[PDB]
Amino acid sequence: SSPGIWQLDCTHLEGKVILVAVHVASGYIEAEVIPAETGQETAYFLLKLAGRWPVKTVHTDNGSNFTSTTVKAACWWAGIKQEDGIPYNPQSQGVIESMNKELKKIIGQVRDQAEHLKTAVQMAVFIHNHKRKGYSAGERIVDIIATDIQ
Amino acid sequence: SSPGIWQLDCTHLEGKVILVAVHVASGYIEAEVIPAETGQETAYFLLKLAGRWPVKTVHTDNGSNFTSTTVKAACWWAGIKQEDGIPYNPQSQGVIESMNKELKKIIGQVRDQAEHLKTAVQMAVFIHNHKRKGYSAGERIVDIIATDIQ
Ligand SMILES: O=C(O)CC[C@@H]1COc2c(ccc(/C=C3\c4ccccc4C[C@@H]3O)c2C(=O)O)O1
Ligand SMILES: O=C(O)CC[C@@H]1COc2c(ccc(/C=C3\c4ccccc4C[C@@H]3O)c2C(=O)O)O1
């Protein structure tokens, strides 16, 4: 349902993979650094996400993760409708690509404050979700989900 | 504030450390498997948590994490009031110990479905946060925070 729809997004930095889930209706994200995007990594990430937020539907980031039996197993396990990420709405791509740009910008802005990329990525998550644009993504996801629960 | 209060909790399984943050007012948790509880691990965990939920106050799980300059640095970074976890209210201990028991029980119930402990721990997180007792911890945290935002 709109409150339960998430989009996977994979971006690259420093020869490494940043896996992002975006809560579509709010722009709230969770993200992780992984060595490579595998079915297993994506599956584990989805499990973590769905344990933390009511994930009804995941638009996978690519066909490999859509196809991956490990990813399907995690979606099955976590009660997630695994969908493709075909941007039937073309604005989806631009929104995602812009977020990736923004996230990389923030990572660069914090990069020196931490030895490791994964720390910088979580700093970026924090900054992204708290950023007032004046509600934050964090406030929006909670509000959206709360309204839905009620 | 009651919606922003979290409690760190560290428990052990299979020669490994499960670090748990409990949202006190709701019972919602996030958790991770780490090799050992270090200041660095705790700091990184807190950063992740605070990027994801509005963490105003963290009651640390022990004095080492309370003392840790790395943990203080993360709390500073993430805007978290780092507090002790002294159970001035004695019911806190029993609540925490019971949750640890429950979490271990769930981990045991899923342990065979996954090769790795960390997967089983995230399964347990999922099960704990979705469990209806009939609202779930997941529903409660969102509601609490939503009410507060309003
Ligand atoms: O073992 C794992 O899971 C990863 C452990 C990570 C390792 O990276 C780090 C870590 C813990 C700390 C740091 C350093 C800082 C840090 C960490 C969190 C919040 C603010 C700050 C400010 C300060 O710079 C780093 C790092 O320097 O990147 O814990
Ligand atoms: O490397 C990292 O950061 C994450 C690594 C994780 C850890 O191991 C795993 C993994 C990915 C998958 C699994 C297996 C399963 C799994 C995982 C999630 C949800 C349901 C299931 C059902 C199925 O059993 C395991 C595992 O067997 O535990 O990737």
Rounded Cα gap, residues A26 and A95, in angstroms: 12
Assign residue A136 the CATH number of its domain: 3.30.420.10
Map chain B to HEC letters: CHHHEEEEEEEEECCEEEEEEEECCCCEEEEEEECCCCHHHHHHHHHHHHHHCCCCEEECCCHHHHHCHHHHHHHHHHCCEEECCCCCCCHHHHHHHHHHHHHHHHHHHHHHHCCCHHHHHHHHHHHHHHCECCCEHHHHHHHHHHHHHC
Contact A52 B123 (CB under 8 A): no
Distance from CA of A28 to the nearest CA of B (A): 8
Sheet holding A57-59, edge to edge: A28-34, A16-23, A5-13, A57-59, A81-83
- SS3 (DSSP) at A115: coil
Q: Is the CB of A142 under 6 A from ligand 2?
A: no
Take residue B15 and report the two structure tokens written for it.
């020669």
Q: In sequence order, what are the residues at sequence separation of 6 or more whose Cβ sits closer than 8 angstroms to the Cβ of residue B105? A: none
- CA A139, distance to chain mean position in Å, is 16
Cβ of B115 closer than 6 Å to ligand 2, yes or no, is yes
Domain extent at residue B92:
1-150
Q: Return the residue whose CA atom lies nearest to atom 2 of ligand 1.
A: B41
What is the C-alpha to C-alpha distance for residues A50 and A56, in angstroms, rounded to an integer?
Answer: 8
Q: How far apart, in whole angstroms, are the C-alpha atoms of residue B135 and residue A108?
A: 41
* Cα of B43 from ligand 1 centre, angstroms: 6
Q: Determine the residue of chain B that is closest to A28 in CA distance.
A: B52
Partner-chain residue, chosen from B119, B147, B149, that has the shortest CB–CB distance to A44: B119
**Whether B76 contacts chain A with CB within 8 A:** no
Name the token pair of A140. Answer: 């929006």
Measured N-to-C along each axis, helices B91-110 and B117-130 cross at an angle, to the nearest 10 degrees, of: 120
* Contact flag B44-A149 (C-beta cutoff 8 Å): no
Q: Is B113 in the pocket of ligand 2 (CB under 6 A)?
A: yes
Q: How many CA atoms lie within 13 A of A14 on its CB side?
A: 14
- How many domains in chain A? 1
* Experimental technique for the deposited model: X-ray
Best mutation target among A30, A143, A149 (most B Cβ atoms within 10 Å) is: A149
Contact partners, residue A136, CB within 8 Å, separation at least 6: A129, A130
Question: What CA–CA distances, in Å, run from A82 to A9, A46, A73, A78, B29?
Answer: 14, 10, 10, 10, 25
A27: DSSP letter = T
Per DSSP, the three-state class of A20 is strand
Rounded Cα gap, residues B10 and B18, in angstroms:
6
Using H for helix, E for strand and C for coil, what is the string for A49-81?
HHHHCCCCEEECCCHHHHHCHHHHHHHHHHCCE
CA atoms of A142 and A125, how far apart (whole Å)? 16
Tokens of A43: 């599956």
B25 vs B114: CA distance, rounded Å: 31
Within 8 A by CB and 6+ apart from B93, the residues are B87
Sign of the Cα torsion A24, A30, A36, A42 reads negative
With CA atoms as reference, report the closest residue to A36 among A60, A12, A57.
A12
Ligand 2 pocket check for B126: Cβ under 6 Å: no
- Which amino acid type is present at position B83? E
Residues linked to residue A33 through DSSP beta bridges, in sequence order:
A18
* DSSP letter, residue A111: G
Contact B23, B9 (CB under 8 A): no
